[PDB]
């Protein structure tokens, strides 16, 4: 009589830009009415980002289109009739391969044109969920923070900074790499220094 | 010496969610510096939505990721050196197949549950570029505006309205169809009327 | 000295048509040489279906493009130097949402036009991994095998058969539904019977 | 009475991996029966690669999924009733951006390890429709055929060959580039030569 989840919502791991479909099977008499929520705020289907669907035998599903990290959160489904109300919950995690995104390239590489003494930042956006490990190299030498370079890593970009001002010797090829469980990506940036 | 477009920008027609790439070839001495614009506002590449790329021999390209109708506009590319500045222009049109988007479905169809006398609207979002022709039917009878139904069509949705209040006879299966040059889509909505 | 997997291959579950990337980290001196295998047969990278990539610090990855159920199997990675050889193994499972594929539709539905006494099969291809549960209904009545209908389900299609020959009463709307953990899909076929 | 194409098939240009939809509108009494053909061989819809669809008012469409260059050809639609038969024809051209596909990479670049005197080929698959212009460079020097290098370009790959046997001086970074109207792509291959 009161609503029950005969098949409960499953936690999902979905690749970025795929559709995530959350499915459950509800029993109860009278037939329970189902509502869907993202972090406790009701989802009203719009036909585009969110589609809500029902099938004979008590099957309910929510399709979330083209998932991004913004969709990676907890969802609830609620089933109600005059006999009671109950919810179930699932998390969606969205897998985003580690990726370096060069805004501008010259010959397949980043290019920074600096003048001597200029405090240069080589700012490189990246993606990745799980958050990727970021590394920088000049040629075949790993860069970390020392007296010469500063590395900045935020949620969305990494910058290699020359806080003391660039020197002529700073010219060269810098390699930035992002790694997580879904892949490794690297790109090169050429820095040249003019007087 | 002054900049010239040896290969000018081409007008593009790109399918929705594909990447649009605008390419040109620039000559001039000194090597011209190129800037890109959307409707006369400079595009600053971010690595995601917009990537700007350059190749030996004067080739310049802008990649616009995952195009939507918002990207369907006029773009300019400008080439400048100390000898002069000139631009070229291309339009991007984004092809979106006609598509009906049911927010909620029961057994593959829309469902509207109405009470007698209720002023019902069956509101159906749709997509399509070129803007699609919208038609409504009840069974095998085309509906237009008459003394009984009102059809609303906007840029993003169409509603079949029962402005006089639904009658029991209004129960049934309504078919909405969107057509343009890239395809036809239709969906059905079942209306039931309770006392 | 001998090769070791500092980071072993991970079992993967990838959505159909996405790229699967298998990644590992190898140590050893001299630097081990890595080969990749699908079910014990070496993968020779072609740049399209298969790309093999290596990065400083001993990282190795195989990218399998646009995965289909044919790619859902066991893979091996082998690392060899003069000190030894060792492999690691991962399974790729490819998630394919349950989906019904109507070859031909009239007004959004299948259509079968039969004559009385004709042994009709309504043959419906479907996809789904895990293999989906298939159900058939006429209106709101579940069909299984009885004295009247025969249901065939294979790896790739389901047919509703009328082995005794269709009767006039067999006319109507048949609903076929495929369900797995990644979604539910249904479609309708209208059967009409002529004398 | 006899069949007529009120709306004839349109020539299509579709991006690689998109769906191509060919649509027409047929008149005639009795209602004409429509068949579809690829290069004069009938298409039998399978629900996957090919879906054939019909809508009230005489609309007929063929959906070709996930188009490849193999689909880029001429199609016919035929409409027949007892009063006559007529066909219409459209070409599908499939746009494939120029793209270089490195089978194996080390640090983002191809890698060829050669011994002195070895007749090396650096074999690089590529895609592009229209067929792309291919160029090779060593550093900032364009390579064509001369007494030292041989360039091979086929429908699917390009090789830079060292027909005389590699010399130590052949070591270095070779850049291969593919260009067509839908974009430019380049990749680098490092060649090292051991005694």
Curated annotation (Swiss-Prot), chains A, B, C, D:
Transmembrane segments: none annotated. It is found in: Cytoplasm; Nucleus. Residues 3-93, 103-194 form the Ig-like domain. Isoforms 3, 7 and 8 are expressed in cardiac muscle. Isoform 4 is expressed in vertebrate skeletal muscle. Isoform 6 is expressed in skeletal muscle (at protein level). Autophosphorylated. Interacts with MYOM1, MYOM2, tropomyosin and myosin. Interacts with actin, primarily via the PEVK domains and with MYPN. Interacts with FHL2, NEB, CRYAB, LMNA/lamin-A and LMNB/lamin-B. Interacts with TCAP/telethonin and/or ANK1 isoform Mu17/ank1.5, via the first two N-terminal immunoglobulin domains. Interacts with TRIM63 and TRIM55, through several domains including immunoglobulin domains 141 and 142. Interacts with ANKRD1, ANKRD2 and ANKRD23, via the region between immunoglobulin domains 77 and 78 and interacts with CAPN3, via immunoglobulin domain 79. Belongs to the protein kinase superfamily. CAMK Ser/Thr protein kinase family. It is linked to Myopathy, myofibrillar, 9, with early respiratory failure: An autosomal dominant myopathy characterized by adulthood onset of weakness in proximal, distal, axial and respiratory muscles. Pelvic girdle weakness, foot drop and neck weakness are the main symptoms at onset, but ultimately the weakness usually involves the proximal compartment of both upper and lower limbs. Additional features include variable degrees of Achilles tendon contractures, spinal rigidity and muscle hypertrophy. Respiratory involvement often leads to requirement for non-invasive ventilation support. ZIS1 and ZIS5 regions contain multiple SPXR consensus sites for ERK- and CDK-like protein kinases as well as multiple SP motifs. ZIS1 could adopt a closed conformation which would block the TCAP-binding site. The PEVK region may serve as an entropic spring of a chain of structural folds and may also be an interaction site to other myofilament proteins to form interfilament connectivity in the sarcomere. In some isoforms, after the PEVK repeat region there is a long PEVK duplicated region. On account of this region, it has been very difficult to sequence the whole protein. The length of this region (ranging from 183 to 2174 residues), may be a key elastic element of titin. Key component in the assembly and functioning of vertebrate striated muscles. By providing connections at the level of individual microfilaments, it contributes to the fine balance of forces between the two halves of the sarcomere. The size and extensibility of the cross-links are the main determinants of sarcomere extensibility properties of muscle. In non-muscle cells, seems to play a role in chromosome condensation and chromosome segregation during mitosis. Might link the lamina network to chromatin or nuclear actin, or both during interphase. This is Titin. It comes from Homo sapiens. The gene is TTN.
């Amino acid at each position: 009589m009161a609503p029950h989840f005969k098949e409960e919502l499953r936690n999902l791991n979905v690749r970025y830009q795929s559709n995530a479909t959350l499915v459950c099977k509800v029993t109860g008499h009278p037939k329970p009415i189902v509502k869907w929520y993202r972090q406790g705020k009701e989802i009203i289907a719009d036909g585009l980002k969110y589609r809500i669907q029902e099938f004979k035998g008590g099957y309910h599903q929510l399709i979330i289109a083209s998932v991004t990290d913004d969709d990676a959160t907890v969802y609830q489904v609620r089933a109600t009739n005059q006999g009671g109300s109950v919810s179930g919950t699932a998390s969606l995690e969205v897998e985003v391969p580690a990726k370096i995104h060069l805004p501008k390239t010259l010959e397949g590489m980043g290019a920074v044109h600096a003048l001597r003494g200029e405090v240069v930042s080589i700012k490189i956006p990246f993606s990745g969920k799980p958050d990727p490990v970021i590394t920088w190299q000049k040629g075949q030498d790993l860069i970390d923070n020392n007296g010469h370079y500063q590395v900045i890593v935020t949620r969305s970009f990494t910058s290699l900074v020359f806080p003391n001002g660039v020197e002529r010797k700073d010219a060269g090829f810098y390699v930035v790499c992002a790694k997580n469980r879904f892949g490794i990506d690297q790109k090169t940036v050429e820095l040249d220094v003019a007087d």
